[PDB]
Design a protein around this ligand. Structure first.
Ligand SMILES: *[C@@H]1O[C@H](CO[C@@H]2O[C@@H](C)[C@@H](O)[C@@H](O)[C@@H]2O)[C@@H](O[C@@H]2O[C@H](CO)[C@@H](O[C@@H]3O[C@H](CO[C@H]4O[C@H](CO)[C@@H](O)[C@H](O)[C@@H]4O)[C@@H](O)[C@H](O[C@H]4O[C@H](CO)[C@@H](O)[C@H](O)[C@@H]4O)[C@@H]3O)[C@H](O)[C@H]2NC(C)=O)[C@H](O)[C@H]1NC(C)=O
Ligand SMILES: *[C@@H]1O[C@H](CO[C@@H]2O[C@@H](C)[C@@H](O)[C@@H](O)[C@@H]2O)[C@@H](O[C@@H]2O[C@H](CO)[C@@H](O[C@@H]3O[C@H](CO[C@H]4O[C@H](CO)[C@@H](O)[C@H](O)[C@@H]4O)[C@@H](O)[C@H](O[C@H]4O[C@H](CO)[C@@H](O)[C@H](O)[C@@H]4O)[C@@H]3O)[C@H](O)[C@H]2NC(C)=O)[C@H](O)[C@H]1NC(C)=O
Ligand SMILES: *[C@@H]1O[C@H](CO)[C@@H](O[C@@H]2O[C@H](CO)[C@@H](O[C@@H]3O[C@H](CO[C@H]4O[C@H](CO)[C@@H](O)[C@H](O)[C@@H]4O)[C@@H](O)[C@H](O)[C@@H]3O)[C@H](O)[C@H]2NC(C)=O)[C@H](O)[C@H]1NC(C)=O
Ligand code: HEC
Ligand code: HEC
Ligand SMILES: *[C@@H]1O[C@H](CO)[C@@H](O[C@@H]2O[C@H](CO)[C@@H](O[C@@H]3O[C@H](CO)[C@@H](O)[C@H](O)[C@@H]3O)[C@H](O)[C@H]2NC(C)=O)[C@H](O)[C@H]1NC(C)=O
Ligand SMILES: *[C@@H]1O[C@H](CO)[C@@H](O[C@@H]2O[C@H](CO)[C@@H](O)[C@H](O)[C@H]2NC(C)=O)[C@H](O)[C@H]1NC(C)=O
Ligand SMILES: *[C@@H]1O[C@H](CO)[C@@H](O)[C@H](O)[C@H]1NC(C)=O
Ligand SMILES: *[C@@H]1O[C@H](CO)[C@@H](O)[C@H](O)[C@H]1NC(C)=O
Ligand SMILES: [Ca+2]
Ligand SMILES: [Ca+2]
Ligand SMILES: [Cl-]
Ligand SMILES: [Cl-]
Lengths: 106, 465, 57, 105, 465, 51
C-alpha cells in the first residue's frame, strides 16, 4: 500500500491520490467524459464498414474533409503578430508530459 | 501488423481511404496508413473499448524523467553520486550536453540522412526527436536538471545521488508547472476562459480525478494550427544562420543529425523566440508540410496530420462536435444557418455540412479548430472548455502541486515564483539575449528582447540544510 | 536494449583504479537488467550492435 | 442499429442510438466515483492483513454487523405508514435493474 | 478454491472472517463464505477492476421477459400463436397459472424440503425463488402478461404470436414504470427529494447515460432494513392461514414448495398487503433472520446479509461514506462530534468511529442506512441522492419511456394512467378485497381495504386495428 | 439444459392431429437449440433427467 509519508513523486504516478493510487499513473486507461460512440456499440469505429451511416448521414472520409476544409495555399500564411513559435513548441513539449497513446508495432 | 504497407482493413489497421480527384494521391487503391490505438482490455466482448495513456498525467516533467521505472534509471548517470541525468558520450554542442542516443528496433532518424548515421535520442518520452525544435526543449531541460544538481551539491555536500536527483527533479517539475499555468495557458484560453476554468488555486482536493480524458488527447491537438512550414535558425545576432536558415519541415522530422552536426540547439532556440507562430484562421487552418508531407522521408508516403487527427477521434470512439458542445454547456447548432452563426462564417459552415451532413457528426478536432478564437486566446469556446477543464484537474488533483502546503516551504515558493523560460535559456546555452517576458508573446527582434541580466536568477539559498 | 552511454559504464567496471563503491553501484545497476557479470554485460552490448572489439579479452 | 423500431430489444441494445450498449445487459457498470482498492486496481480493503485504509484498520464486516446492526428482534417497530408490499416491490424492482454475477462453485 | 466450504482466501474467494466476540459463530477458524463478483476484464494489469450487470438497466420488466435472447425464448409458449409466456405443466394454483420450473445443477430449492421435490422456478431473473413473496410477484406479472395477450387477441384476431407478445410486454413494462414512479419512489424518497431528483418529465434526452452505477447496487440494498422476520399468510377474511401463518424467514428462503403445495400465491399476496413493513431506526437496523440465518437451509452456515453488503462494497472498490457525501453535495464529518450532528445521534456516531476510526471509511450501506430518514420517506439524504439520481437517468435516458412521444398513443397513455397494482391483483387472483390506492402505504385490514368491483379495469379499446 | 415445460412441445410434435404450422415452428425452436430431429429432442430430455 502507499507509504503514509512521501517526500517525492513516484516515477509512474502511483500513490499521488492515496485513496485511489492509480489515478494519474502511467499505463492506465483514459477516463471518459462522455460514453464512446462506435459503429457496433463497443469496438468498431465509424468509417469501418462501408455503407454504415452515423446518426442518419454517411461518414465523411477524413482525408476528404482535410482536402475540402483544411487545405490552403502555403503562400498566404498569416503570421501571428502576438505569439512566438516557442508558443507552439511549449504546447508539444507539454503535450508529451500529459499523454501518449500506444498503438501496436509493425 | 502490415499496416504501414498494406491497405487492407484488418485489425489492428484502420487505413484512411483516398477520395476521388485527390490533390496528391492519384491512385485510389492506395491509402494513408494508420494503426488503431491499443485497447485497454484486448479482445473483450464486455467492455466498451478504451485506450491507454502510457504517461503520468501530472505536470511532473515526465518528458525529462520518464514514466516507467527502468527507463527512469536508464536516463540517470549511474557512474557517480552527483545525481545527474545521462548525457551523450560521443557529441557535444559547443561543450554543453546533448541528449544520449536510443537503441531502437526500427530507427527512423537514421533514414533522414543515411551518411550522417545519427540515431534518435533518449528522453523520458519516446517522441523527443520528432522535430529538432522539440529536441532542443528536451535538451535544455536536461541541462537545467544537471545545473540544479550541481548547484545543490555545492550547498549540501553530504547529499547522496538519490537526494540530489530527486530535489533537482522536484524543482524542474515546479518550473514546468509555473511556466505552464502562469505564462502558457493564459495565452491559449484568453483572460475570460482563464478566470472561468482556472480560478485561483486554493488547495489540494483529493476528490479531483487527475486523469487525462480521452477527448483531451484529440482536443489539445489544436496546436497543429500553429505550425509554421519551416525550421528557423539564427546566429548569435539573431540573423539567419549560415548552413540552411529556412528548412522545410518535411526535411526536419526525425532529423536528429541537424542538432548534432548543424550547430546544436542555440540557433533553434533563437528562431523559436524570434519567429512568429502561425495564426489559425478559418480559411488557413493547417499547412501542407503536415497535411501532405508529414514524415515523408521515413515512410512509403507522406501523411496528412489533420486527417490522422480525425481518423484517430473515430478510432477512440469520441462523440461528435454537438455532443461536446452539449457537454460544455454551449448551444448545439442543427442547421447550416445556426452553425454559420456559431462559427460567424457561413461559407465554412456550409462546407462542414456538405461533408458531415449534421453538426452532430463533425469530428471534435475539426469542429474545435473551426471555431473563432476567443479574445486574447488561440482557441474557441469548445476547445477552451475541454483544455481548461483538463488543466484544472491536473492542478487541483495533484498532491505534489508546487503551491500545495507541505510540498515546498514558503520561502522556496517565493523563490520559485521568480523563475521563467528566458532565464532557463540563459543559464544553459550560449544565448546571451533573450525574450522579454512573456516569452510566448514576445516574437520580434530586437524590440522584444533583453540581455541575460535584467532577469532574476533562481535563488536556491532556501534549499540548504 | 543496451544503450550507447552504458558503454561508458563498462569502462568504469574495467578501470582497476576506480572507487569500489561506484563499481558496486554499477554492477547493481546492471543486475536489475538481468546482467550479473562483466562478461554478460559485454555480450549484451555485442548483441545489441555495439563495437566490443577492445574487450575481446 | 435499425433506424426504425416499435419494440424494445430483449438485451437493451439500441435503446441509445449514438452509444447502443448503454443500458444493455452483460456490460460493465458505470462508475460515479473512481474505485478504491488496496493495491489501486483489484484487491479489496480487508484482503492483506495489516493494511490500513486511509490511516485506520479495516473493520471486519461481521464485527460492524454485530456491534451496530444487531438489535433484539422482539422490539421491532412496525411501520404504520408502509406495507410489506412496499418492501417486496423494492426487491422485484431491483431485480429489473441489476444482477452482479459471481463465479459458480 | 471452493469458496462455499473452504476458508482459505485465494481467488475467487474473499471470505468474511469472524470476530472473537461473535454471538453466533464461536470458532474463529470458521468464516462466512463469499465469492468476489466477476470482473469485467479478467486478469488485466491495466484497467481498474469493475463489475458486470447481467440485466438491462431500464425499468422494462426484464425480470419477467429475460435480458438475453435464448432465455427470453424459453420463457415463451412456443406451441401456438397467442403470444403467451410459458406456465407450469405439472401444477396450478386453483386453476391459475404458476411459473415454469428451471433445470439447474445444484438446485437449492430442492434442499429446503427434500420430500417435496419442487425445483426452483424459471423467470426472467435467476433470483425469482429466493423468497416466496418475491415469487408471488413474479407469478402475478406472468398471469397479467397472459391476460393482456388473451384480451388483445379478442380485439385483434389477425395479430400473430410475435405481435401479441411484443404488445403485451410493452404494456407490462409501462405498468412497472408507472407503479414505480407514481407510487413506489415518492414513498422511498419523500416529497422533497422527489422534487429535487425526479422533477416533472419533459422528454427523452439521448445524452442521459442510463447505466446502473456500481454504488447503486449497494445503496439500493437500503430495503434490507424493511425486512420483517416472518412470512405471513392470510385467508380470504384476512385472518391467519390455518397451517403455519407466521413462518420464520430462515425456513422460506428458496422454498418454492410453499408456493406450490401450501396454498399458492393468494395467502402470500394478502399477507403482503395487510402486514406492515418494518421501520428502519438507528437502533433497529436489521433483523436476526437475515443477519444470522440467511439461507440457513441451503448452506453450511447461515450468512449475515448486512455483513455481506459491506464485504461486497469492498469487493467492488466502492469509496467510503464521506466520498459519497461529497459526491452528493452534503457536508462531510471528520470527528465523532460532527458525525453525531450529521446523524442526529451521538451514540450511533461513537459506535461507528469505534469500528471505523473515521467517517471516511464507513461503508456506504452502513453510512447510508444509519442516517435519519427524510420526512415521509424511508431513506436519509445520502441514499436519496444516489437512488433518486439513478432513477432519473433510467427515465430521461429511456427511449421507450411510456410518456415519451411516439411510444404510446395519446389515448393509450390516458388508459395506462389508470392502472394500479391492486387492480392487477384483482384481475389475476381469487382476491376480491384489496388495499386502497397506494398499496405501499395501506397496510391494515379492514380500514385500508376495498372491494375489487370499485376499481376501474385497464381499457384496451385504443389497442385496436 | 432441457426444461420441463418443453416436454409438452414433444406431445405436440407427436400428436398427429395438430397442424403442421405449429409443428414446423416447434421444430425450428428446437433446431435453434441444436436438437434437429425428434430423436435428438427426446434424448436431450432423457439426458437432462426427465422421462
Ligand atoms: C440532456 O441531459 C444532459 C445530461 O444531464 C445530466 O443528466 C440529467 C439526467 C440531469 O441530471 C441533468 O441535470 C444532468 O446535467 C444535459 O447535459 C449536461 O448539461 C450540463 C449543463 O450544461 C453540463 O454541465 C457542464 O459541464 C461542463 C464541463 O464540466 C463537466 O464535466 C467535468 C468532467 O467530468 C466535471 O469536472 C464538471 O464538474 C462538469 O460536470 C462545465 O464546464 C459546465 O460548467 C460551467 O457551466 C455553466 C455555464 O458555462 C456555469 O455553471 C459555470 O460557468 C461552469 O464553470 C457545466 O457544468 C453537462 O456536462 C452536460 N452533460 C452531458 C452528458 O452532456 C443536457 O443539457 C440535457 N438537455 C436537455 C434538453 O434536457
Ligand atoms: C473537491 O472537488 C470535487 C470535484 O469537483 C469537480 O472538479 C473540480 C475540479 C471543480 O471543477 C469542481 O467545480 C467540480 O465539481 C468537488 O465535489 C463535487 O461537488 C459537487 C457539488 O457539491 C458535486 O455535485 C453534485 O453532484 C450530485 C450528484 O449528481 C452528480 O453526478 C451525477 C452522475 O455523474 C450527474 O448526473 C450529475 O450531473 C452530478 O454531476 C448532484 O445531485 C448535485 O446537484 C443537485 O444539487 C445541487 C445543489 O443542491 C443543485 O444545484 C442541482 O441542480 C441538483 O439539485 C451536485 O451536482 C460533485 O458530484 C462532486 N464531485 C465529486 C467527485 O465529489 C468537491 O466539492 C471539492 N471540494 C473542495 C473543498 O474543493
Ligand atoms: C415438506 O413438504 C411436504 C409437502 O410435500 C409437507 O407435507 C405435508 O405437510 C402437511 C402438514 O403436516 C400435511 O397435512 C396434513 O394432511 C393430513 C391428510 O391429508 C391428505 O390430503 C392431502 C390433500 O388434501 C394429501 O396431500 C395427503 O397426502 C393426504 O391424502 C391431515 O390429516 C392433517 O390434519 C394435515 O392437514 C400434508 O398432508 C403433508 N403432505 C403433503 C403431500 O402435503 C411437509 O410438511 C414438509 N416438511 C417440512 C419439514 O416442512
Ligand atoms: C496531444 C497531442 C497528440 C496526441 C498524443 C497522444 O495522446 O498520443 C498529438 N499531437 Fe501533435 N505534432 C506532430 C508534429 C510533427 C508536430 C510538429 C513538432 C506536432 C506539434 C504539436 C503541438 C504544437 C501540439 C499541442 C499544442 C501537439 N502536437 C499535440 C498533440 C505530430 C503528431 C503526430 C504524428 C501525432 C499522432 C497522429 C496520429 O496518428 O493519431 C500527434 N502529433 C498527436
Ligand atoms: C439491489 C439489491 C442487491 C444487489 C443486486 C446485484 O446487483 O447483484 C441485493 N439486494 Fe437484497 N434481499 C435478499 C433477500 C433474502 C431479501 C428478502 C426477500 C432481499 C430483499 C431486498 C430488498 C427489499 C431490496 C431493495 C428494496 C433488495 N433486496 C435489494 C438488493 C437477499 C439478497 C442477497 C443474498 C444478496 C447478495 C448479497 C451478496 O452476497 O453481496 C442481495 N439481496 C443483494
Ligand atoms: C401454451 O398455451 C396453451 C393454450 O393456452 C396451453 O394449453 C393448455 O395447457 C393446460 C396445461 O397443460 C391445459 O390445462 C388442463 O387440462 C388438463 C386436461 O387436458 C387437466 O388435467 C388439468 O388439470 C388442466 O385443467 C389446457 O387444457 C391446455 N389448453 C389447450 C387449448 O391446449 C399450453 O399449456 C401452453 N404451454 C405452455 C408451455 O405454457
Ligand atoms: C547529410 O549529412 C551530412 C553530414 O554527414 C551533411 O554534410 C555536411 O555538408 C557539408 C557541405 O555540403 C559537407 O562539407 C560535410 O559532409 C558536412 N559538413 C561538415 C562541416 O562536415 C550533408 O549536407 C547532409 N545532406 C542532407 C541532404 O541532409
Ligand atoms: C467473443 O465472442 C466470440 C464469438 O462468440 C468468441 O470467439 C470470443 O472468444 C469472445 N471473446 C471473449 C473474450 O470471450
Ligand atoms: C556522468 O558524469 C560524469 C561527470 O560529470 C561525466 O563525465 C560522464 O560522462 C557522465 N556519464 C554519463 C553516462 O552521462
Ligand atoms: Ca506527466
Ligand atoms: Ca431491466
Ligand atoms: Cl472523453
Ligand atoms: Cl459508482
Amino acid at each position: 500500500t502507499c507509504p503514509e509519508q512521501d517526500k517525492y513523486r513516484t516515477i509512474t504516478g502511483m500513490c499521488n491520490n492515496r485513496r485511489s493510487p492509480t489515478l494519474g499513473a502511467s499505463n492506465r486507461a483514459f477516463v471518459r467524459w462522455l460514453p464512446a460512440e462506435y459503429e457496433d456499440g463497443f469496438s468498431l469505429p465509424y468509417g469501418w464498414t462501408p455503407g454504415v451511416k452515423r446518426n442518419g448521414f454517411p461518414v465523411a472520409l477524413a482525408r476528404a474533409v482535410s482536402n475540402e476544409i483544411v487545405r490552403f495555399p502555403t503562400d498566404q500564411l498569416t503570421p501571428d503578430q502576438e505569439r512566438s513559435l516557442m508558443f507552439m513548441q511549449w504546447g508539444q513539449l507539454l503535450d508529451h508530459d500529459l499523454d501518449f497513446t500506444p498503438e501496436p508495432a509493425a | 501488423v502490415n499496416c504501414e504497407t498494406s491497405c487492407v482493413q484488418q485489425p489492428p489497421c484502420f487505413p484512411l481511404k483516398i477520395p476521388p480527384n485527390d490533390p496528391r494521391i492519384k491512385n485510389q487503391a492506395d491509402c494513408i496508413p494508420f494503426f488503431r490505438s491499443c485497447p485497454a482490455c484486448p479482445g473483450s466482448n464486455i467492455t466498451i473499448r478504451n485506450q491507454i495513456n502510457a504517461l503520468t498525467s501530472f505536470v511532473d516533467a515526465s518528458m525529462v524523467y520518464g514514466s516507467e521505472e527502468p527507463l527512469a534509471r536508464n536516463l540517470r548517470n549511474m557512474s557517480n553520486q552527483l545525481g545527474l541525468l545521462a548525457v551523450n558520450q560521443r557529441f557535444q554542442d559547443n561543450g554543453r550536453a546533448l541528449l544520449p542516443f536510443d537503441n531502437l528496433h526500427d530507427d527512423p532518424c537514421l533514414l533522414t540522412n543515411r551518411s550522417a548515421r545519427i540515431p534518435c535520442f533518449l528522453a523520458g518520452d519516446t517522441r523527443s526527436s520528432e522535430m529538432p525544435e522539440l529536441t532542443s526543449m528536451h535538451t535544455l531541460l536536461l541541462r537545467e536538471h544537471n545545473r540544479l544538481a550541481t548547484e545543490l551539491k555545492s550547498l549540501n555536500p553530504r547529499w547522496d545521488g538519490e537526494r540530489l536527483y530527486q530535489e533537482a527533479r522536484k524543482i524542474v517539475g515546479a518550473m514546468v508547472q509555473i511556466i505552464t499555468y502562469r505564462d502558457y495557458l493564459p495565452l491559449v484560453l484568453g483572460p475570460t476562459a482563464m478566470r472561468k476554468y482556472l480560478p485561483t488555486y486554493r488547495s489540494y482536493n483529493d476528490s479531483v480525478d487527475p486523469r487525462i480524458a480521452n477527448v483531451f488527447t484529440n482536443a489539445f491537438r489544436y496546436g497543429h494550427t500553429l505550425i509554421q512550414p519551416f525550421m528557423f535558425r539564427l546566429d548569435n545576432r539573431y540573423q539567419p544562420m549560415e548552413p540552411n536558415p529556412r528548412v522545410p519541415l518535411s526535411r526536419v522530422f526525425f532529423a536528429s543529425w541537424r542538432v548534432v552536426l548543424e550547430g546544436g540547439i542555440d540557433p533553434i532556440l533563437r528562431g523559436l523566440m524570434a519567429t512568429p507562430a502561425k495564426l489559425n484562421r478559418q480559411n488557413q487552418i493547417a499547412v501542407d508540410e503536415i497535411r501532405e508531407r508529414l514524415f515523408e522521408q521515413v515512410m512509403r508516403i507522406g501523411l496528412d496530420l489533420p486527417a490522422l487527427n480525425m481518423q484517430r477521434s473515430r478510432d477512440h470512439g469520441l462523440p461528435g462536435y454537438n455532443a461536446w458542445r452539449r457537454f460544455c454547456g454551449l448551444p448545439q447548432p442543427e442547421t447550416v444557418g445556426q452553425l454559420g452563426t456559431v462559427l460567424r462564417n457561413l461559407k465554412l459552415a456550409r462546407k462542414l455540412m456538405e461533408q458531415y451532413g449534421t453538426p452532430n457528426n463533425i469530428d471534435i478536432w475539426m469542429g474545435g479548430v473551426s471555431e473563432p478564437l476567443k479574445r486574447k486566446g488561440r482557441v474557441g469556446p469548445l476547445l477552451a472548455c475541454i483544455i481548461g477543464t483538463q488543466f484544472r484537474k491536473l492542478r487541483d488533483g495533484d498532491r505534489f502541486w508546487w503551491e500545495n502546503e507541505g510540498v515546498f516551504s514558503m520561502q522556496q515558493r517565493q523563490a520559485l515564483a521568480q523563475i521563467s523560460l528566458p532565464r532557463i535559456i540563459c543559464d544553459n546555452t550560449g544565448i546571451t539575449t533573450v525574450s522579454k517576458n512573456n516569452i510566448f508573446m514576445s516574437n520580434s527582434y530586437p524590440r522584444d528582447f533583453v540581455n541575460c541580466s535584467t532577469l532574476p536568477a533562481l535563488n536556491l539559498a532556501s534549499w540548504r540544510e | 536494449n543496451f544503450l550507447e552511454h552504458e558503454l561508458s559504464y563498462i569502462d568504469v567496471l574495467l578501470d582497476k583504479n576506480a572507487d569500489q563503491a561506484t563499481k558496486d553501484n554499477l554492477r547493481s545497476y546492471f543486475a536489475d537488467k538481468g546482467l550479473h557479470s562483466i562478461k554478460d554485460i559485454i555480450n549484451k552490448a555485442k548483441q545489441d550492435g555495439f563495437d566490443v572489439s577492445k574487450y575481446e579479452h
